[PDB]
Amino acid sequence: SAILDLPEPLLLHILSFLTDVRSRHRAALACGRMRAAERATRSELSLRGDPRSPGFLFLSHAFRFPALEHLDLSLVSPWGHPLLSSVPEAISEQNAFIAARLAGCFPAVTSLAVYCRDPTTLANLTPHWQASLRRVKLVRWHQRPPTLPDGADLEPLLETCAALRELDLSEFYCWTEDVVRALTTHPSATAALTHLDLGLAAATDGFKSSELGPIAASCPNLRKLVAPCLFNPRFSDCVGDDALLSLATSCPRLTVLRLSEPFEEAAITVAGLVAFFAALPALEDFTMDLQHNVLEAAPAMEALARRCPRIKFLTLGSFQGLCKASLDGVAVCGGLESLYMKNCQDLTDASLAAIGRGCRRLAKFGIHGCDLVTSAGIRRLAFTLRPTLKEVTVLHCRLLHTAECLTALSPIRDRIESLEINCVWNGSWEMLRSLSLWFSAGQLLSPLISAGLDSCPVLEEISIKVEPAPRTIFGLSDLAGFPVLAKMKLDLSEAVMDLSLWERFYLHGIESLQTLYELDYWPPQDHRSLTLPAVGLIQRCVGLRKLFIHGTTHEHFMTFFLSIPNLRDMQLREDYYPAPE
Amino acid sequence: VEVALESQTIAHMVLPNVTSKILAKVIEYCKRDADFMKIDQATLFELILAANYLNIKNLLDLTCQTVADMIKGKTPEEIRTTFNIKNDFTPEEEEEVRRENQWAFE
């Protein structure tokens, strides 16, 4: 064996490049030596099954990953249950053991993702990794236990983990109050923090100005901040110009800033943004995704280009007058690689032509709800940006219909890697790897293969999100043409037993997809439940290895394994607010 | 040749271990795509050994990356046949590995 003749360090080096989880698992089964090579070089693990069981606890000393940096415990069984909680003295003894075993298997964790139902989970795990742990992601879709003190959920992390730099509460439901008290009362931990995602499971009315102020003030070392904010000027505690300038002076190191308003003029003026960008020279990544409008925004965009030369990724919602060709506004930001524009009501073809010349480095372009842009605008842009433009998003633009939009993007059909469109019905896509499709309820998929998108030789993932006749089907079977289509997100959560007819409408013909490997399915809502016809149709997907339903099934989960020949990864993941038991 | 500084085992020298077949290809690499890796298996592993010995980090990264893709998407039996590996496990210690793997999501 020429591979096994190599010095062991080099076999390890080979294995360090193999990122596919299944391939790693097969390599480990090859020989005892590659087993050693795989275990010693695996960088990340998402833990499958129940670590409480003796089956995990009494695994070999060989089940060890000395170089594992990212451990994901958030997906352990049963999904979303308390892990290592305390809610008598007998239980702390068994919790200590389970924790110590995880430390044994994974001694070097620097990035942890966990389902944190209450602080005691973190209090149990963290002592074992407190010296090494730099990033912590919290996951909780269940309601915040009402009996907890403010900031109790983050208490164990800010006390113990002296290496902590990154905190990812994007999918962690708690109250904004919890985040404020915690981050304002642990200065020794909080002054070190560089990354902060405060999404709070997207179930918050946004952070208020008197909440954003003290968090930023307590974190002088922030470089990335992602946060929902209350931008609504009907309320006096909303994030305005003052909250922005304070954010910039409190965090003068911010390179990535992504603020969005949870779905009239905003309390944010152009002059306040000029002042804001003036204080943030090292800004590379800027998102302001608002429901309320920022009017005549071009001068602030020019100030952005002037004051923040590093600016690469721009996403703006409800910004008006971002570019008008009488180079103007956004078209002066030559450094841009990514431009996304939601609800720009005065963005014209002339604007896209001006963005085409000005923003030469653009690889990702997006317009959402810009109702003055035509096929001509898109045609010119896709043509001008041909050497670079690889990702396109066109959503809910009134004058832009799917058929003419796909023809407009033809200048780059052979180059485009990622597409996102909403379907509206009034040659090879050579590089198209990823597709996102948005539908109205009762709208057909079938005419998509006629409107363009006939052949997609490298398309491996499709995403379908929905925002009616007796025998008509949505027509997933029309994706059987796409030869390497393996992953699918079918999101019907916002589409609407009574639901059995809608589930059947959408899911019918899913069996046709010969090469479907991974399926993420979201059933329609009113405790979201799959109906039997939906179960019957997903059963017929013989190609499935991974199946994740978001909601529940009273139909035995064991039926799926006995149906689907090669199903391995299967879970019901109620990853929405608020989760049941 | 000049190009020599890409080998750390030369920048530290301010080669009786590598044959001319491999040294010429090491040299032809350092003229500074992946069609250079259209090489056979025997000389690929000789190129890995040379890249490490000569301490060319860039060459070593690419050559080992090629071997990773060679393992990727292959069943255990197919990995064994690709690299002429003898199956070193007892039925008991193989089902140990197979059981261990089930604790990680694919």
XYZ file of C-alpha atoms in Angstrom:
687
model
C 0.000 0.000 0.000
C 1.582 3.230 -1.268
C -0.729 5.390 0.940
C 0.156 3.376 4.067
C 3.873 3.446 3.179
C 3.813 7.243 3.727
C 4.905 8.669 7.094
C 1.812 8.894 9.325
C 1.877 12.787 9.494
C 1.291 12.839 5.708
C -1.607 10.325 5.799
C -3.145 12.660 8.377
C -2.536 15.581 6.019
C -4.441 13.756 3.256
C -7.361 13.074 5.628
C -7.410 16.755 6.741
C -8.656 17.648 3.234
C -11.521 15.118 3.156
C -14.480 17.240 4.365
C -17.375 14.896 3.420
C -18.656 13.276 6.636
C -19.756 9.967 5.007
C -16.429 9.676 3.108
C -14.523 10.198 6.389
C -16.616 7.418 7.956
C -15.823 5.045 5.074
C -12.100 5.951 5.156
C -12.088 5.085 8.879
C -13.580 1.650 8.030
C -10.882 1.005 5.384
C -8.106 0.076 7.829
C -7.119 0.528 11.476
C -4.509 3.070 10.396
C -6.867 5.334 8.444
C -9.227 5.062 11.424
C -6.402 6.640 13.436
C -5.845 9.189 10.624
C -9.560 10.143 10.435
C -10.131 10.425 14.188
C -6.966 12.528 14.678
C -7.835 14.988 11.858
C -11.638 15.428 12.100
C -12.275 19.126 12.697
C -16.038 19.034 13.352
C -18.753 16.719 14.627
C -22.511 17.015 14.932
C -23.466 14.469 17.620
C -26.091 11.921 16.493
C -28.186 10.014 19.030
C -28.506 10.295 22.805
C -25.253 10.961 24.792
C -27.138 10.036 27.988
C -27.433 6.383 26.871
C -24.842 3.771 28.006
C -24.227 3.197 24.259
C -22.359 6.524 24.062
C -20.896 6.554 27.587
C -19.220 3.150 27.262
C -17.690 3.616 23.798
C -14.005 2.843 23.309
C -11.108 5.055 24.398
C -10.550 4.984 20.587
C -13.602 7.192 20.030
C -11.439 10.312 20.253
C -10.926 13.443 18.169
C -7.751 15.242 19.421
C -8.020 17.993 16.760
C -11.829 18.496 16.862
C -12.533 22.240 17.061
C -16.292 22.515 16.403
C -18.674 20.277 18.343
C -22.401 20.428 17.660
C -24.544 19.018 20.466
C -27.706 20.911 19.442
C -29.051 17.994 17.382
C -28.844 15.267 20.074
C -31.797 12.979 20.882
C -34.470 13.531 21.847
C -34.376 16.796 19.838
C -34.681 20.012 21.854
C -34.842 18.315 25.272
C -32.920 19.525 28.363
C -29.318 18.332 28.080
C -27.508 17.990 31.449
C -30.107 20.100 33.322
C -30.855 20.140 37.081
C -34.636 20.887 37.237
C -31.971 15.064 43.537
C -28.191 15.246 44.219
C -28.096 11.904 42.309
C -28.625 13.699 38.969
C -25.585 16.028 39.317
C -23.349 12.943 39.705
C -24.577 11.438 36.415
C -24.412 14.872 34.694
C -20.776 15.264 35.762
C -20.008 11.840 34.224
C -21.679 12.553 30.847
C -19.884 15.936 30.664
C -16.498 14.363 31.487
C -17.050 11.712 28.768
C -17.711 14.446 26.174
C -14.455 16.079 27.331
C -12.771 12.680 26.841
C -14.115 12.225 23.306
C -13.653 15.875 22.363
C -10.835 17.416 24.480
C -10.043 20.432 22.270
C -13.447 22.065 21.529
C -13.049 25.759 20.604
C -16.473 26.173 18.927
C -19.571 24.688 20.597
C -23.191 24.541 19.486
C -25.688 23.385 22.090
C -29.427 23.147 22.765
C -29.636 25.255 25.919
C -33.035 24.839 27.611
C -31.796 26.450 30.862
C -28.369 27.776 32.188
C -27.481 24.496 34.025
C -26.759 22.835 30.655
C -23.922 25.329 30.124
C -22.807 25.262 33.775
C -22.258 21.465 33.383
C -20.426 21.423 29.999
C -18.273 24.573 30.075
C -15.769 23.772 32.914
C -14.345 21.007 30.685
C -13.682 23.393 27.742
C -13.435 26.846 29.435
C -9.738 27.252 28.596
C -10.225 26.536 24.860
C -13.808 27.596 24.052
C -13.901 30.685 21.788
C -17.249 30.443 19.978
C -20.507 29.399 21.635
C -23.736 28.991 19.659
C -26.921 28.673 21.665
C -30.054 27.018 20.236
C -33.500 27.317 21.890
C -36.832 27.415 20.080
C -38.720 26.658 23.294
C -39.977 29.596 25.359
C -37.585 31.161 27.851
C -38.448 29.611 31.274
C -40.373 32.499 32.977
C -38.908 31.812 36.459
C -35.314 32.733 35.486
C -33.602 35.981 36.587
C -32.543 38.412 33.816
C -29.379 37.340 31.982
C -29.394 33.905 33.640
C -29.141 32.118 30.270
C -25.694 33.591 29.520
C -24.502 33.647 33.160
C -22.528 30.335 33.005
C -20.668 31.368 29.813
C -19.595 34.827 30.987
C -18.418 33.477 34.354
C -16.345 30.475 33.182
C -15.162 30.759 29.532
C -12.119 33.072 29.646
C -11.250 32.388 25.969
C -14.735 33.317 24.656
C -14.798 35.716 21.692
C -17.884 34.783 19.680
C -21.463 34.434 20.819
C -24.171 33.180 18.468
C -27.628 33.730 19.921
C -29.174 33.858 16.398
C -31.358 30.801 17.058
C -31.527 31.211 20.837
C -34.861 32.486 22.087
C -34.516 34.618 25.160
C -35.632 38.196 25.883
C -33.610 41.288 24.856
C -33.648 42.131 28.592
C -31.669 38.860 29.181
C -28.940 39.847 26.696
C -28.631 43.405 28.112
C -28.256 42.544 31.821
C -25.837 39.679 31.099
C -23.529 41.655 28.780
C -23.570 44.778 30.987
C -22.721 42.940 34.266
C -19.788 40.729 33.195
C -17.177 43.299 31.992
C -14.154 40.935 32.161
C -15.788 38.489 29.708
C -17.725 41.078 27.694
C -14.748 43.410 26.947
C -13.037 40.529 25.085
C -16.022 39.717 22.797
C -15.523 40.305 19.059
C -18.527 38.540 17.437
C -22.163 38.903 18.472
C -25.251 37.531 16.737
C -28.375 38.591 18.558
C -31.079 37.193 16.256
C -32.891 35.699 19.281
C -34.688 33.022 17.238
C -36.291 35.782 15.087
C -39.069 36.062 17.707
C -38.351 39.566 19.019
C -39.728 43.023 18.172
C -36.110 44.148 17.866
C -33.528 45.567 20.250
C -34.412 49.029 21.515
C -32.001 51.987 21.439
C -31.673 51.904 25.254
C -30.716 48.233 24.864
C -28.335 48.596 21.894
C -26.553 51.506 23.647
C -25.403 49.625 26.804
C -24.439 46.416 24.888
C -22.181 48.324 22.450
C -20.829 50.420 25.337
C -19.877 47.237 27.235
C -18.174 45.649 24.185
C -15.306 47.917 22.990
C -13.734 44.990 21.115
C -16.680 44.037 18.852
C -15.827 43.567 15.189
C -19.020 41.814 14.073
C -22.561 42.609 15.249
C -25.704 40.985 13.851
C -28.905 42.263 15.519
C -32.655 42.794 15.025
C -33.469 46.379 16.021
C -36.666 48.311 16.696
C -36.377 50.905 13.919
C -40.068 51.944 14.080
C -40.196 55.721 14.843
C -43.748 55.423 16.295
C -41.884 54.323 19.470
C -39.457 56.759 21.133
C -36.978 54.050 22.171
C -36.297 53.070 18.534
C -32.825 52.848 16.919
C -32.164 56.214 15.245
C -29.173 58.389 14.282
C -28.113 58.774 17.913
C -28.176 55.018 18.536
C -26.087 54.600 15.342
C -23.377 57.164 16.179
C -23.141 55.631 19.680
C -22.795 52.168 18.150
C -19.928 53.443 15.955
C -18.045 55.254 18.748
C -18.667 52.439 21.300
C -17.460 49.849 18.796
C -14.809 51.606 16.638
C -13.520 48.181 15.530
C -16.735 47.012 13.796
C -15.944 45.453 10.393
C -19.238 43.559 9.959
C -22.539 45.212 10.945
C -25.895 43.678 10.082
C -28.989 45.384 11.480
C -32.513 44.511 10.385
C -36.015 45.475 11.480
C -38.478 42.627 12.282
C -41.294 42.773 9.671
C -43.271 56.012 6.743
C -39.746 57.385 7.284
C -37.223 55.815 9.698
C -35.517 57.767 12.513
C -32.331 57.312 10.437
C -31.312 60.260 8.271
C -28.653 60.508 5.523
C -26.676 63.083 7.566
C -26.685 60.681 10.541
C -25.392 57.854 8.305
C -22.586 60.064 6.916
C -21.530 60.678 10.546
C -21.968 56.957 11.255
C -19.768 55.760 8.327
C -17.211 58.465 9.238
C -16.619 56.703 12.585
C -16.369 53.186 11.095
C -13.371 53.204 8.671
C -12.744 49.424 8.810
C -16.340 48.496 7.826
C -16.321 45.674 5.251
C -19.856 44.339 5.602
C -22.951 46.516 6.074
C -26.620 45.530 6.324
C -29.483 47.888 7.082
C -32.617 45.931 6.191
C -35.539 48.173 7.181
C -39.338 48.262 6.825
C -39.357 52.070 7.244
C -37.687 54.176 4.532
C -34.410 56.111 4.454
C -35.022 58.815 1.831
C -32.569 60.146 -0.805
C -29.821 57.783 0.372
C -27.235 58.465 -2.393
C -25.143 61.061 -0.443
C -24.755 58.536 2.423
C -23.616 55.892 -0.094
C -21.001 58.315 -1.448
C -19.862 58.918 2.142
C -19.688 55.125 2.580
C -17.432 54.825 -0.487
C -15.309 57.791 0.715
C -14.974 56.896 4.434
C -15.125 53.077 4.449
C -12.747 52.021 1.636
C -12.856 48.382 2.749
C -16.644 48.081 2.049
C -17.387 44.866 0.109
C -20.804 43.539 1.172
C -23.781 45.894 1.043
C -27.386 44.958 1.837
C -29.971 47.720 2.174
C -33.703 47.498 2.866
C -36.071 50.465 2.238
C -33.201 52.761 1.219
C -34.458 55.158 -1.496
C -32.498 56.974 -4.219
C -29.490 54.649 -3.883
C -28.453 55.365 -7.477
C -30.006 57.558 -10.175
C -28.179 58.149 -13.471
C -28.546 61.795 -14.592
C -21.737 58.030 -11.207
C -24.212 58.331 -8.358
C -24.552 56.881 -4.832
C -24.063 53.098 -4.699
C -22.333 53.118 -8.130
C -19.390 54.990 -6.511
C -18.746 52.002 -4.221
C -16.229 50.361 -6.591
C -15.015 47.884 -3.948
C -18.388 46.096 -3.755
C -18.468 42.345 -4.414
C -21.988 41.985 -3.045
C -24.927 44.329 -3.500
C -28.451 43.569 -2.283
C -31.260 46.119 -2.468
C -34.725 45.588 -0.951
C -37.599 48.038 -1.563
C -35.777 50.695 -3.610
C -38.792 52.259 -5.319
C -36.819 54.702 -7.503
C -34.073 52.294 -8.691
C -34.212 52.251 -12.500
C -32.560 50.541 -15.491
C -30.338 53.643 -15.599
C -29.298 52.768 -12.040
C -28.288 49.200 -12.981
C -26.300 50.524 -15.956
C -24.496 52.905 -13.560
C -23.890 50.091 -11.016
C -22.544 48.019 -13.953
C -19.767 50.521 -14.714
C -19.064 51.654 -11.146
C -19.110 48.330 -9.266
C -16.690 46.309 -11.436
C -15.923 43.755 -8.702
C -19.572 42.610 -8.199
C -20.073 38.838 -7.881
C -23.414 38.820 -6.017
C -26.328 41.044 -7.028
C -29.820 41.167 -5.537
C -32.962 43.247 -5.975
C -36.087 42.667 -3.877
C -39.326 44.571 -4.558
C -37.779 47.225 -6.816
C -40.779 47.768 -9.082
C -39.174 50.128 -11.656
C -36.493 47.678 -12.894
C -37.109 45.934 -16.255
C -35.544 43.041 -18.240
C -33.382 45.669 -20.020
C -31.785 46.727 -16.704
C -30.997 43.095 -15.865
C -29.761 42.336 -19.448
C -27.341 45.297 -19.401
C -26.066 44.497 -15.900
C -25.612 40.743 -16.534
C -23.710 41.697 -19.712
C -21.515 44.443 -18.137
C -20.666 42.304 -15.093
C -19.964 39.102 -17.111
C -16.333 38.525 -15.911
C -17.383 38.490 -12.201
C -21.160 38.162 -11.550
C -21.947 34.638 -10.321
C -24.925 35.017 -7.945
C -28.262 36.670 -8.757
C -31.370 37.351 -6.667
C -34.479 38.782 -8.342
C -37.507 38.790 -6.051
C -40.920 40.485 -6.275
C -40.044 43.096 -8.889
C -43.367 43.923 -10.634
C -41.960 44.568 -14.131
C -39.683 41.506 -13.862
C -41.473 38.265 -14.742
C -39.715 34.869 -14.523
C -39.677 34.097 -18.284
C -38.177 37.462 -19.340
C -35.906 37.540 -16.243
C -34.291 34.203 -17.168
C -33.768 35.572 -20.711
C -32.285 38.765 -19.225
C -29.743 36.689 -17.291
C -28.725 34.801 -20.433
C -25.508 36.920 -20.829
C -24.255 34.893 -17.812
C -26.282 31.612 -18.076
C -23.056 29.607 -18.607
C -21.349 31.354 -15.634
C -24.087 31.882 -12.983
C -23.613 29.660 -9.903
C -26.524 30.668 -7.665
C -30.008 31.890 -8.606
C -32.938 33.107 -6.526
C -36.228 33.992 -8.192
C -39.930 34.120 -7.452
C -42.114 32.423 -10.009
C -44.600 34.641 -11.865
C -46.295 33.582 -15.140
C -47.860 36.924 -16.272
C -29.429 26.223 -23.497
C -27.511 24.828 -20.515
C -27.135 26.527 -17.129
C -23.535 25.299 -17.136
C -22.388 26.402 -13.686
C -25.710 26.722 -11.769
C -25.087 24.776 -8.561
C -27.826 26.276 -6.369
C -31.428 27.405 -7.049
C -34.050 29.158 -4.874
C -37.681 29.399 -5.947
C -40.517 31.342 -4.330
C -44.170 30.594 -5.036
C -47.668 31.812 -4.270
C -50.034 29.158 -2.876
C -51.597 26.978 -5.591
C -49.064 28.139 -8.166
C -47.511 25.550 -10.505
C -43.827 24.623 -10.733
C -44.274 22.987 -14.190
C -44.052 26.153 -16.376
C -40.572 26.913 -14.919
C -38.936 24.311 -17.199
C -40.576 26.118 -20.152
C -39.751 29.718 -19.038
C -36.023 28.849 -19.071
C -34.188 26.371 -16.781
C -34.525 23.399 -19.168
C -31.129 21.828 -18.449
C -29.110 22.304 -15.270
C -26.262 19.723 -15.555
C -24.581 20.631 -12.222
C -27.624 21.679 -10.109
C -27.352 19.755 -6.832
C -29.650 21.738 -4.535
C -33.076 23.308 -4.979
C -35.001 25.374 -2.455
C -38.761 25.927 -2.683
C -40.696 28.340 -0.431
C -44.461 28.986 -0.623
C -46.014 32.262 0.645
C -55.579 24.595 -6.474
C -57.715 22.336 -8.765
C -58.818 18.722 -7.867
C -56.355 16.747 -10.062
C -53.577 19.335 -10.595
C -50.243 18.785 -8.841
C -47.491 21.371 -8.129
C -45.227 19.106 -10.202
C -41.971 18.270 -8.409
C -41.614 15.388 -10.909
C -40.551 18.026 -13.482
C -37.238 18.341 -11.601
C -36.426 14.728 -12.575
C -34.735 16.267 -15.629
C -31.952 17.742 -13.468
C -29.309 14.954 -13.363
C -27.318 15.592 -10.127
C -30.091 17.218 -8.001
C -29.454 15.780 -4.551
C -30.462 18.272 -1.838
C -33.912 19.862 -1.485
C -35.480 22.367 0.914
C -39.273 22.149 0.578
C -40.669 24.953 2.759
C -44.478 25.014 3.013
C -44.586 26.391 6.590
C -46.245 29.642 5.431
C -48.369 27.979 2.682
C -51.743 28.146 4.503
C -56.809 16.228 7.718
C -57.691 19.510 5.943
C -54.001 20.111 5.050
C -53.664 16.614 3.461
C -54.825 18.015 0.118
C -52.161 20.772 0.123
C -49.374 18.415 1.257
C -50.380 15.968 -1.481
C -50.535 18.817 -4.034
C -46.954 19.871 -3.327
C -45.290 16.519 -2.534
C -46.750 14.536 -5.467
C -44.085 13.205 -7.820
C -41.177 13.593 -5.354
C -40.434 9.876 -5.959
C -39.483 10.736 -9.578
C -36.330 12.509 -8.386
C -33.941 9.565 -8.740
C -30.928 11.301 -7.165
C -32.626 13.050 -4.196
C -30.343 12.390 -1.198
C -31.153 15.020 1.480
C -34.638 16.471 2.171
C -35.564 19.319 4.501
C -39.353 19.451 4.686
C -41.518 22.088 6.384
C -45.227 21.087 6.714
C -48.052 23.699 6.518
C -49.151 25.414 9.763
C -52.483 26.256 11.487
C -47.652 21.899 16.581
C -47.075 21.437 12.813
C -48.059 17.919 11.693
C -47.451 15.755 8.605
C -50.542 14.043 7.165
C -50.508 10.388 5.989
C -50.501 11.166 2.202
C -47.390 13.300 2.766
C -45.819 10.428 4.764
C -46.810 7.998 1.995
C -45.184 10.192 -0.663
C -41.923 10.780 1.286
C -41.786 7.006 1.994
C -41.500 6.521 -1.794
C -38.234 8.534 -1.881
C -35.904 5.520 -2.042
C -32.810 7.693 -2.650
C -33.037 9.444 0.754
C -30.129 9.251 3.219
C -31.093 12.343 5.220
C -34.647 13.418 6.079
C -35.471 16.346 8.341
C -39.106 17.245 8.971
C -39.713 20.552 10.752
C -42.834 19.749 12.750
C -44.000 16.293 13.858
C -45.359 12.873 12.888
C -47.544 10.636 15.045
C -46.785 7.971 12.400
C -43.972 5.767 13.857
C -40.505 7.058 12.835
C -39.372 3.413 12.438
C -41.706 2.999 9.415
C -39.462 5.409 7.478
C -36.315 3.295 7.982
C -38.102 0.064 7.020
C -39.454 1.857 3.913
C -36.440 3.866 2.764
C -33.574 1.375 2.099
C -30.691 3.769 2.868
C -32.166 6.322 5.292
C -29.654 7.047 8.073
C -30.087 10.617 9.322
C -33.672 11.217 10.348
C -35.043 13.734 12.821
C -38.137 15.742 13.663
C -36.775 19.238 14.356
C -39.332 21.727 15.665
C -36.958 24.647 15.032
C -39.547 27.433 15.280
C -40.927 29.703 18.012
C -42.500 28.367 20.047
C -41.424 24.702 20.217
C -43.640 22.027 21.899
C -42.648 18.994 24.009
C 17.119 27.245 -12.216
C 16.554 30.343 -9.988
C 11.956 29.312 -8.394
C 14.172 27.426 -5.899
C 12.975 29.604 -2.960
C 9.534 27.885 -3.115
C 11.360 24.915 -1.560
C 11.968 25.700 2.144
C 14.697 23.013 2.099
C 16.630 25.544 -0.045
C 15.881 28.861 1.736
C 17.202 27.136 4.894
C 20.272 26.099 2.813
C 21.912 29.571 2.817
C 19.338 16.293 -2.869
C 20.213 12.548 -2.746
C 16.644 11.485 -1.816
C 14.567 12.611 -4.839
C 14.922 11.013 -8.323
C 15.172 13.158 -11.503
C 11.681 12.075 -12.707
C 10.156 13.612 -9.559
C 12.630 16.544 -9.224
C 11.865 17.662 -12.807
C 8.137 17.693 -11.964
C 8.871 19.463 -8.662
C 10.804 22.036 -10.766
C 8.014 22.283 -13.404
C 5.522 22.936 -10.580
C 7.511 25.920 -9.314
C 7.173 27.972 -12.499
C 5.272 30.826 -10.821
C -4.410 24.336 -13.586
C -4.891 21.031 -11.694
C -4.154 19.097 -14.932
C -0.625 18.774 -13.489
C -2.199 16.168 -11.156
C -3.215 13.944 -14.135
C -0.238 11.836 -12.920
C -0.288 8.075 -12.118
C -0.688 6.761 -8.535
C 2.939 5.644 -7.922
C 4.444 8.997 -8.968
C 1.698 10.913 -7.072
C 2.842 9.423 -3.751
C 6.457 10.029 -4.770
C 5.443 13.661 -5.418
C 3.903 13.907 -1.900
C 7.125 12.518 -0.344
C 9.256 14.947 -2.397
C 6.999 17.933 -1.552
C 7.377 17.176 2.159
C 11.134 16.458 1.995
C 11.729 19.618 -0.092
C 9.170 21.412 2.136
C 7.095 22.974 -0.666
C 3.869 23.656 1.264
C 1.852 24.634 -1.852
C 2.784 21.462 -3.764
C 2.117 19.254 -0.723
C -1.324 20.833 -0.178
C -2.372 20.151 -3.797
C -0.931 16.606 -4.023
C -2.569 15.503 -0.748
C -5.829 17.295 -1.746
C -5.823 15.073 -4.901
C -5.540 11.928 -2.699
C -8.455 13.221 -0.583
C -10.684 13.529 -3.696
C -9.499 10.017 -4.597
C -10.875 8.707 -1.263
C -14.070 10.864 -1.477
C -17.314 9.110 -2.487
C -15.776 5.619 -2.320
C -17.074 2.689 -0.202
C -14.616 1.097 2.308
C -13.972 -1.815 -0.111
C -13.339 0.659 -2.981
C -10.845 2.656 -0.845
C -9.002 -0.613 -0.119
C -8.844 -1.467 -3.859
C -7.765 2.079 -4.911
C -4.805 2.121 -2.506
C -4.038 -1.625 -2.177
C -4.906 -1.640 1.557
C -5.354 -4.912 3.505
C -8.478 -4.955 5.739
C -6.825 -4.918 9.180
C -9.978 -5.350 11.333
C -11.501 -8.233 13.274
C -15.292 -8.467 12.561
C -15.655 -7.245 16.172
C -13.369 -4.198 15.899
C -14.862 -3.249 12.512
C -18.408 -3.210 13.950
C -16.838 -1.077 16.708
C -15.794 1.502 14.047
C -19.179 1.150 12.293
C -20.942 1.713 15.646
C -18.717 4.718 16.470
C -19.487 6.425 13.152
C -23.221 6.352 13.976
C -22.620 8.950 16.718
C -21.968 11.639 14.095
C -24.497 13.170 11.705
C -23.539 12.890 8.039
